[PDB]
Amino acid sequence: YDIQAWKKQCEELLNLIFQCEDSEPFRQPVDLLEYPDYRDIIDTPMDFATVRETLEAGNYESPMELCKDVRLIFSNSKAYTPSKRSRIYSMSLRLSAFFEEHISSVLSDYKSALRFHKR
Numbered sequence: 001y002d003i004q005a006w007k008k009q010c011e012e013l014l015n016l017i018f019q020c021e022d023s024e025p026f027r028q029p030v031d032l033l034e035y036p037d038y039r040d041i042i043d044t045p046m047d048f049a050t051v052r053e054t055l056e057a058g059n060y061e062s063p064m065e066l067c068k069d070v071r072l073i074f075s076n077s078k079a080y081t082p083s084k085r086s087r088i089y090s091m092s093l094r095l096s097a098f099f100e101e102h103i104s105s106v107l108s109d110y111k112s113a114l115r116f117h118k119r
């Protein structure tokens with residue numbers, strides 16, 4: 001019932017994601033000169049370095065907020081892809097499956113800890 005445990009669990013998951021070759025296109029903000037129209041399509045850019053820095057700054061209050069930002073990385077990739085068969089979009093689908101598989105227990109444990117605190 002540790003209410004704070006999610007933070008280190010998210011740091012460890014981000015470390016695994018950074019080790020994944022599939023995270024390469026998502027480690028830093030999208031290159032705006034390589035894709036000059038990016039901001040015409042994407043309203044809120046997001047990347048894993050921004051997520052890690054927000055976490056390390058103490059600017060996430062819960063793992064749900066971190067999860068919303070990570071999911072935004074994947075929805076931005078889906079929105080920008082010209083095809084569902086593209087290389088970068090295909091990498092995002094595998095990385096999303098990996099992330100969802102590992103974040104599920106982090107969210108469940110945090111929500112359970114909060115419920116115990118208010119029992």
Ligand SMILES: CCN(CC)c1cc(C)nc2ncnn12
Nearest residue numbers: 025030035077080081086088089
């Ligand atoms: C600029 C956005 N990026 C990288 C996240 C791209 C680029 C290309 C070429 N294909 C893509 N398919 C999905 N996202 N995507």
